[PDB]
Amino acid sequence: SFFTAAPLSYNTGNSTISLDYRSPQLRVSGGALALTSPVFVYQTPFNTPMRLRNGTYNEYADAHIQMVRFGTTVLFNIDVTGETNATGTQTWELQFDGTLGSCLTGRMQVMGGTGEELDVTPTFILPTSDKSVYKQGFMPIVCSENGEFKQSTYCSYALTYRLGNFYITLKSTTSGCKPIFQMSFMYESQIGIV
Amino acid sequence: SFFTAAPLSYNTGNSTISLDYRSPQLRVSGGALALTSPVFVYQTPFNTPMRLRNGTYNEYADAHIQMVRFGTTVLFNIDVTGETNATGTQTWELQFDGTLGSCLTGRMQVMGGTGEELDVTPTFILPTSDKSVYKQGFMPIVCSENGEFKQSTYCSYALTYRLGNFYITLKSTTSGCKPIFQMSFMYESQIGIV
Amino acid sequence: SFFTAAPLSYNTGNSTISLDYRSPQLRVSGGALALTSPVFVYQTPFNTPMRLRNGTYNEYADAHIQMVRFGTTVLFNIDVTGETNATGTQTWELQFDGTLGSCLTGRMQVMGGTGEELDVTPTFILPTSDKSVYKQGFMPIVCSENGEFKQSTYCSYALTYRLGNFYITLKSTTSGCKPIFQMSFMYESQIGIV
């Protein structure tokens, strides 16, 4: 009495309507359609940067942060706009709840493509369930101000746990300029999205 | 007289067949199934790099460009192959329609993972047109030629609107060499995919 | 008798139940629902970095590698930890079967967001089915060791085919530090995911 158009299908044998889906890309979890590899972005809200402090110094920066989850990888991106000219090494540190992944340093949200916040625990940014991470390195950066080149330099990144919480610690090295730069790196998360 | 297999369900109360989905991953858009955070790419066509001129000078480059949207984030990547050795700073300007996002400087296409062009207006690349916002910065780049290292240097990027249109302006600085480099940076789009 | 809730719809003119979907995001392939631009990651397994040799020198490094496919672009990322304070330049080469894409140099797997391996042939990392490619460049890198800056330098990358197989060849230039660095770059794949 009715027909079903692909990707819906009807089995006359058992009188059952099904959805056919490609299993490398889509799956069913708890009876509900989902993706095998959804994109989630955990970020500072739209043009709403986080206020960071250089350790105990009276030196601050605004930071826009995006943490993009692709498969089990996390692409970390930060845009730092320091307020104060400095020589030496500044420590910009981000703290995340060791269970939830929620940023404790400033406000971040899981953000869909519509621009709406998603009510999704950000555990997908945590490197491990067991707190045993090792990840560190350096990226080249270029400091500038008002469109003018200031300095070619570098910034370290390190992933650690302290007092049970997850830290991403960034250390920029400057020689008179304001620490104003963008950098990115990738790390792996062993936390699956199910 | 019929049943439904998950992720399809049937409610006896209201005689209604539904699709059950995970709302952080899938959603309904104007009656139709969609992703919460779809990937979209606006790019130069396969083997069809864009011809760019360095301002008013008789100096040109070919550029392959990809603009990757996920969540509200845009990852911009460019591969610039300059023709002429230069000492100084080159200005590469990309112009896009300020309402539609369409590239005015050369041909770009919205491309699916299928390898087919998608009939999608590329508004998803457009950042905030608030004229008090000056999204910009610098990235480190390496100039080379035919696999040979030439220079470690830098390139600026600046996002602006003027004359109703969206501009990405890149400025590469060279000493002696052709401007031949790849660079990427991230920004945010104001335009929700709905 | 039945009703349908969006995204399911019923056409009374032809007695057909359909799933409405947004074609730039979702599609139907061989009667099954799929994504237009799925994310796939081809990577080294967690805690199973690949052992790479510097040509025929007795010099090795361990590499975590992710190759993230979005739309038709591949984001390549490598995290290298070498052992031997290098002398000059070291060449790290990855080989992939030119038909199936499988890494022949060491163990890689297609990994879902779920944290589970996916049974997908990795053709999506191949530049073309034609077995031809021209793509080369340099990225700036920073070598470090145990949190300490060592050198700001560069790494070349080149995409080629030899004897019908696809090669990614990286040449890192160090002055007398261990090759310990991360680098990434993007390239285009003309192999559609269909």
PDB file of N, CA, C and O in Angstrom, chain A residues 26-74:
ATOM      1  N   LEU A  26      28.516   6.355   9.008  1.00  0.00           N
ATOM      2  CA  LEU A  26      27.373   6.476   9.897  1.00  0.00           C
ATOM      3  C   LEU A  26      27.240   5.209  10.702  1.00  0.00           C
ATOM      4  O   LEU A  26      27.713   4.147  10.298  1.00  0.00           O
ATOM      5  N   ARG A  27      26.622   5.341  11.859  1.00  0.00           N
ATOM      6  CA  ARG A  27      26.381   4.193  12.743  1.00  0.00           C
ATOM      7  C   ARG A  27      25.130   4.417  13.562  1.00  0.00           C
ATOM      8  O   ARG A  27      24.550   5.494  13.533  1.00  0.00           O
ATOM      9  N   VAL A  28      24.736   3.388  14.322  1.00  0.00           N
ATOM     10  CA  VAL A  28      23.611   3.476  15.235  1.00  0.00           C
ATOM     11  C   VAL A  28      24.115   3.233  16.660  1.00  0.00           C
ATOM     12  O   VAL A  28      24.820   2.269  16.899  1.00  0.00           O
ATOM     13  N   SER A  29      23.761   4.130  17.574  1.00  0.00           N
ATOM     14  CA  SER A  29      24.142   4.021  18.989  1.00  0.00           C
ATOM     15  C   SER A  29      22.919   4.258  19.861  1.00  0.00           C
ATOM     16  O   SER A  29      22.333   5.351  19.831  1.00  0.00           O
ATOM     17  N   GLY A  30      22.542   3.249  20.653  1.00  0.00           N
ATOM     18  CA  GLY A  30      21.367   3.358  21.505  1.00  0.00           C
ATOM     19  C   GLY A  30      20.110   3.620  20.702  1.00  0.00           C
ATOM     20  O   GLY A  30      19.273   4.441  21.095  1.00  0.00           O
ATOM     21  N   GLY A  31      20.025   2.970  19.539  1.00  0.00           N
ATOM     22  CA  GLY A  31      18.904   3.165  18.609  1.00  0.00           C
ATOM     23  C   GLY A  31      18.880   4.449  17.780  1.00  0.00           C
ATOM     24  O   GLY A  31      17.922   4.679  17.072  1.00  0.00           O
ATOM     25  N   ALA A  32      19.903   5.289  17.860  1.00  0.00           N
ATOM     26  CA  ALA A  32      19.883   6.618  17.211  1.00  0.00           C
ATOM     27  C   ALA A  32      21.010   6.748  16.187  1.00  0.00           C
ATOM     28  O   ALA A  32      22.125   6.278  16.434  1.00  0.00           O
ATOM     29  N   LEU A  33      20.710   7.357  15.031  1.00  0.00           N
ATOM     30  CA  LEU A  33      21.715   7.536  13.974  1.00  0.00           C
ATOM     31  C   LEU A  33      22.782   8.537  14.461  1.00  0.00           C
ATOM     32  O   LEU A  33      22.469   9.547  15.102  1.00  0.00           O
ATOM     33  N   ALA A  34      24.021   8.212  14.175  1.00  0.00           N
ATOM     34  CA  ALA A  34      25.151   9.085  14.522  1.00  0.00           C
ATOM     35  C   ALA A  34      26.236   8.927  13.479  1.00  0.00           C
ATOM     36  O   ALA A  34      26.135   8.083  12.577  1.00  0.00           O
ATOM     37  N   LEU A  35      27.289   9.736  13.605  1.00  0.00           N
ATOM     38  CA  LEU A  35      28.453   9.637  12.712  1.00  0.00           C
ATOM     39  C   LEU A  35      29.551   8.821  13.373  1.00  0.00           C
ATOM     40  O   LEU A  35      29.663   8.819  14.620  1.00  0.00           O
ATOM     41  N   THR A  36      30.349   8.142  12.550  1.00  0.00           N
ATOM     42  CA  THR A  36      31.553   7.477  13.016  1.00  0.00           C
ATOM     43  C   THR A  36      32.618   8.519  13.434  1.00  0.00           C
ATOM     44  O   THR A  36      33.269   8.345  14.486  1.00  0.00           O
ATOM     45  N   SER A  37      32.754   9.591  12.644  1.00  0.00           N
ATOM     46  CA  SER A  37      33.779  10.624  12.884  1.00  0.00           C
ATOM     47  C   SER A  37      33.217  12.023  12.822  1.00  0.00           C
ATOM     48  O   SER A  37      33.579  12.787  11.905  1.00  0.00           O
ATOM     49  N   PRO A  38      32.366  12.392  13.809  1.00  0.00           N
ATOM     50  CA  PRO A  38      31.827  13.747  13.825  1.00  0.00           C
ATOM     51  C   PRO A  38      32.919  14.764  14.090  1.00  0.00           C
ATOM     52  O   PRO A  38      33.882  14.464  14.818  1.00  0.00           O
ATOM     53  N   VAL A  39      32.746  15.945  13.525  1.00  0.00           N
ATOM     54  CA  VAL A  39      33.549  17.102  13.894  1.00  0.00           C
ATOM     55  C   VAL A  39      32.935  17.730  15.140  1.00  0.00           C
ATOM     56  O   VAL A  39      31.729  18.003  15.186  1.00  0.00           O
ATOM     57  N   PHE A  40      33.771  17.918  16.179  1.00  0.00           N
ATOM     58  CA  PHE A  40      33.398  18.761  17.303  1.00  0.00           C
ATOM     59  C   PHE A  40      34.454  19.826  17.449  1.00  0.00           C
ATOM     60  O   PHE A  40      35.647  19.512  17.335  1.00  0.00           O
ATOM     61  N   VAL A  41      34.022  21.057  17.678  1.00  0.00           N
ATOM     62  CA  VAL A  41      34.936  22.148  17.989  1.00  0.00           C
ATOM     63  C   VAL A  41      34.654  22.676  19.390  1.00  0.00           C
ATOM     64  O   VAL A  41      33.509  23.054  19.706  1.00  0.00           O
ATOM     65  N   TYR A  42      35.686  22.695  20.233  1.00  0.00           N
ATOM     66  CA  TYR A  42      35.565  23.281  21.549  1.00  0.00           C
ATOM     67  C   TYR A  42      36.322  24.589  21.453  1.00  0.00           C
ATOM     68  O   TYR A  42      37.507  24.551  21.139  1.00  0.00           O
ATOM     69  N   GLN A  43      35.650  25.718  21.671  1.00  0.00           N
ATOM     70  CA  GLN A  43      36.230  27.014  21.415  1.00  0.00           C
ATOM     71  C   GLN A  43      35.814  28.127  22.346  1.00  0.00           C
ATOM     72  O   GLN A  43      34.797  28.048  23.013  1.00  0.00           O
ATOM     73  N   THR A  44      36.597  29.207  22.362  1.00  0.00           N
ATOM     74  CA  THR A  44      36.124  30.421  22.988  1.00  0.00           C
ATOM     75  C   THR A  44      34.979  30.928  22.128  1.00  0.00           C
ATOM     76  O   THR A  44      35.005  30.737  20.892  1.00  0.00           O
ATOM     77  N   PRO A  45      33.964  31.552  22.743  1.00  0.00           N
ATOM     78  CA  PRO A  45      32.788  31.955  21.952  1.00  0.00           C
ATOM     79  C   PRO A  45      33.078  33.086  20.980  1.00  0.00           C
ATOM     80  O   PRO A  45      34.056  33.808  21.142  1.00  0.00           O
ATOM     81  N   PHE A  46      32.189  33.228  20.005  1.00  0.00           N
ATOM     82  CA  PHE A  46      32.392  34.107  18.852  1.00  0.00           C
ATOM     83  C   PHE A  46      32.834  35.485  19.312  1.00  0.00           C
ATOM     84  O   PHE A  46      32.160  36.117  20.139  1.00  0.00           O
ATOM     85  N   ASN A  47      34.006  35.908  18.828  1.00  0.00           N
ATOM     86  CA  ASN A  47      34.616  37.174  19.229  1.00  0.00           C
ATOM     87  C   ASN A  47      34.460  37.443  20.746  1.00  0.00           C
ATOM     88  O   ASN A  47      34.083  38.538  21.170  1.00  0.00           O
ATOM     89  N   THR A  48      34.739  36.416  21.554  1.00  0.00           N
ATOM     90  CA  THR A  48      34.651  36.498  23.017  1.00  0.00           C
ATOM     91  C   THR A  48      35.908  35.828  23.638  1.00  0.00           C
ATOM     92  O   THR A  48      35.844  34.730  24.253  1.00  0.00           O
ATOM     93  N   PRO A  49      37.055  36.513  23.522  1.00  0.00           N
ATOM     94  CA  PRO A  49      38.319  35.874  23.860  1.00  0.00           C
ATOM     95  C   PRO A  49      38.465  35.687  25.351  1.00  0.00           C
ATOM     96  O   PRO A  49      37.808  36.357  26.143  1.00  0.00           O
ATOM     97  N   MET A  50      39.304  34.745  25.715  1.00  0.00           N
ATOM     98  CA  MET A  50      39.597  34.443  27.102  1.00  0.00           C
ATOM     99  C   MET A  50      40.726  35.352  27.577  1.00  0.00           C
ATOM    100  O   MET A  50      41.687  35.550  26.860  1.00  0.00           O
ATOM    101  N   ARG A  51      40.627  35.855  28.801  1.00  0.00           N
ATOM    102  CA  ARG A  51      41.701  36.609  29.428  1.00  0.00           C
ATOM    103  C   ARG A  51      42.715  35.670  30.119  1.00  0.00           C
ATOM    104  O   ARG A  51      42.399  34.952  31.108  1.00  0.00           O
ATOM    105  N   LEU A  52      43.952  35.693  29.605  1.00  0.00           N
ATOM    106  CA  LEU A  52      45.046  34.905  30.142  1.00  0.00           C
ATOM    107  C   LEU A  52      46.019  35.813  30.856  1.00  0.00           C
ATOM    108  O   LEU A  52      46.153  37.000  30.527  1.00  0.00           O
ATOM    109  N   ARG A  53      46.686  35.248  31.839  1.00  0.00           N
ATOM    110  CA  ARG A  53      47.713  35.957  32.608  1.00  0.00           C
ATOM    111  C   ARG A  53      49.033  35.243  32.449  1.00  0.00           C
ATOM    112  O   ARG A  53      49.084  34.022  32.446  1.00  0.00           O
ATOM    113  N   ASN A  54      50.111  36.012  32.311  1.00  0.00           N
ATOM    114  CA  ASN A  54      51.468  35.462  32.299  1.00  0.00           C
ATOM    115  C   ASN A  54      51.885  35.121  33.735  1.00  0.00           C
ATOM    116  O   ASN A  54      52.435  35.969  34.426  1.00  0.00           O
ATOM    117  N   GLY A  55      51.668  33.878  34.171  1.00  0.00           N
ATOM    118  CA  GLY A  55      51.976  33.452  35.548  1.00  0.00           C
ATOM    119  C   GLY A  55      51.408  34.385  36.614  1.00  0.00           C
ATOM    120  O   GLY A  55      50.227  34.642  36.607  1.00  0.00           O
ATOM    121  N   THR A  56      52.255  34.888  37.512  1.00  0.00           N
ATOM    122  CA  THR A  56      51.880  35.896  38.528  1.00  0.00           C
ATOM    123  C   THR A  56      52.217  37.329  38.094  1.00  0.00           C
ATOM    124  O   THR A  56      51.928  38.285  38.821  1.00  0.00           O
ATOM    125  N   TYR A  57      52.798  37.497  36.904  1.00  0.00           N
ATOM    126  CA  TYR A  57      53.107  38.835  36.411  1.00  0.00           C
ATOM    127  C   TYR A  57      51.816  39.618  36.142  1.00  0.00           C
ATOM    128  O   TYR A  57      50.728  39.017  35.965  1.00  0.00           O
ATOM    129  N   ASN A  58      51.942  40.950  36.095  1.00  0.00           N
ATOM    130  CA  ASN A  58      50.829  41.841  35.722  1.00  0.00           C
ATOM    131  C   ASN A  58      50.867  42.109  34.222  1.00  0.00           C
ATOM    132  O   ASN A  58      51.005  43.257  33.760  1.00  0.00           O
ATOM    133  N   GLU A  59      50.737  41.004  33.484  1.00  0.00           N
ATOM    134  CA  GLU A  59      50.828  40.949  32.028  1.00  0.00           C
ATOM    135  C   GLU A  59      49.712  39.986  31.620  1.00  0.00           C
ATOM    136  O   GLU A  59      49.614  38.860  32.170  1.00  0.00           O
ATOM    137  N   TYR A  60      48.855  40.456  30.724  1.00  0.00           N
ATOM    138  CA  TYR A  60      47.691  39.706  30.280  1.00  0.00           C
ATOM    139  C   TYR A  60      47.642  39.682  28.764  1.00  0.00           C
ATOM    140  O   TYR A  60      48.321  40.470  28.096  1.00  0.00           O
ATOM    141  N   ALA A  61      46.834  38.767  28.255  1.00  0.00           N
ATOM    142  CA  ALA A  61      46.579  38.607  26.841  1.00  0.00           C
ATOM    143  C   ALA A  61      45.160  38.141  26.655  1.00  0.00           C
ATOM    144  O   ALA A  61      44.627  37.441  27.521  1.00  0.00           O
ATOM    145  N   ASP A  62      44.578  38.506  25.530  1.00  0.00           N
ATOM    146  CA  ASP A  62      43.313  37.924  25.077  1.00  0.00           C
ATOM    147  C   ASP A  62      43.622  36.793  24.130  1.00  0.00           C
ATOM    148  O   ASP A  62      44.478  36.928  23.255  1.00  0.00           O
ATOM    149  N   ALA A  63      42.922  35.675  24.291  1.00  0.00           N
ATOM    150  CA  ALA A  63      43.176  34.516  23.460  1.00  0.00           C
ATOM    151  C   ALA A  63      41.866  33.986  22.868  1.00  0.00           C
ATOM    152  O   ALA A  63      40.901  33.790  23.594  1.00  0.00           O
ATOM    153  N   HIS A  64      41.846  33.789  21.553  1.00  0.00           N
ATOM    154  CA  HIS A  64      40.831  33.018  20.860  1.00  0.00           C
ATOM    155  C   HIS A  64      41.397  31.629  20.670  1.00  0.00           C
ATOM    156  O   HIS A  64      42.525  31.459  20.178  1.00  0.00           O
ATOM    157  N   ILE A  65      40.630  30.620  21.087  1.00  0.00           N
ATOM    158  CA  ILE A  65      41.104  29.246  21.099  1.00  0.00           C
ATOM    159  C   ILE A  65      40.090  28.362  20.380  1.00  0.00           C
ATOM    160  O   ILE A  65      38.895  28.498  20.619  1.00  0.00           O
ATOM    161  N   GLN A  66      40.581  27.519  19.484  1.00  0.00           N
ATOM    162  CA  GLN A  66      39.764  26.480  18.846  1.00  0.00           C
ATOM    163  C   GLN A  66      40.498  25.157  18.967  1.00  0.00           C
ATOM    164  O   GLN A  66      41.725  25.075  18.717  1.00  0.00           O
ATOM    165  N   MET A  67      39.755  24.134  19.416  1.00  0.00           N
ATOM    166  CA  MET A  67      40.240  22.795  19.568  1.00  0.00           C
ATOM    167  C   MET A  67      39.315  21.925  18.746  1.00  0.00           C
ATOM    168  O   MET A  67      38.144  21.718  19.115  1.00  0.00           O
ATOM    169  N   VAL A  68      39.833  21.453  17.617  1.00  0.00           N
ATOM    170  CA  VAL A  68      39.019  20.777  16.628  1.00  0.00           C
ATOM    171  C   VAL A  68      39.288  19.296  16.675  1.00  0.00           C
ATOM    172  O   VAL A  68      40.424  18.854  16.513  1.00  0.00           O
ATOM    173  N   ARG A  69      38.232  18.518  16.913  1.00  0.00           N
ATOM    174  CA  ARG A  69      38.337  17.067  17.029  1.00  0.00           C
ATOM    175  C   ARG A  69      37.956  16.416  15.683  1.00  0.00           C
ATOM    176  O   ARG A  69      36.793  16.532  15.255  1.00  0.00           O
ATOM    177  N   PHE A  70      38.945  15.784  15.038  1.00  0.00           N
ATOM    178  CA  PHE A  70      38.826  15.119  13.715  1.00  0.00           C
ATOM    179  C   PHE A  70      39.160  13.662  13.976  1.00  0.00           C
ATOM    180  O   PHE A  70      40.311  13.340  14.288  1.00  0.00           O
ATOM    181  N   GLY A  71      38.208  12.749  13.878  1.00  0.00           N
ATOM    182  CA  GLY A  71      38.542  11.376  14.232  1.00  0.00           C
ATOM    183  C   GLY A  71      38.900  11.358  15.714  1.00  0.00           C
ATOM    184  O   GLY A  71      38.119  11.872  16.519  1.00  0.00           O
ATOM    185  N   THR A  72      40.070  10.815  16.056  1.00  0.00           N
ATOM    186  CA  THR A  72      40.635  10.905  17.420  1.00  0.00           C
ATOM    187  C   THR A  72      41.737  11.966  17.591  1.00  0.00           C
ATOM    188  O   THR A  72      42.410  11.980  18.619  1.00  0.00           O
ATOM    189  N   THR A  73      41.949  12.813  16.603  1.00  0.00           N
ATOM    190  CA  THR A  73      42.965  13.862  16.682  1.00  0.00           C
ATOM    191  C   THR A  73      42.341  15.156  17.135  1.00  0.00           C
ATOM    192  O   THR A  73      41.147  15.411  16.889  1.00  0.00           O
ATOM    193  N   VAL A  74      43.149  15.977  17.805  1.00  0.00           N
ATOM    194  CA  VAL A  74      42.760  17.295  18.188  1.00  0.00           C
ATOM    195  C   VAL A  74      43.708  18.276  17.532  1.00  0.00           C
ATOM    196  O   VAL A  74      44.944  18.185  17.736  1.00  0.00           O
TER     197      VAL A  74
END
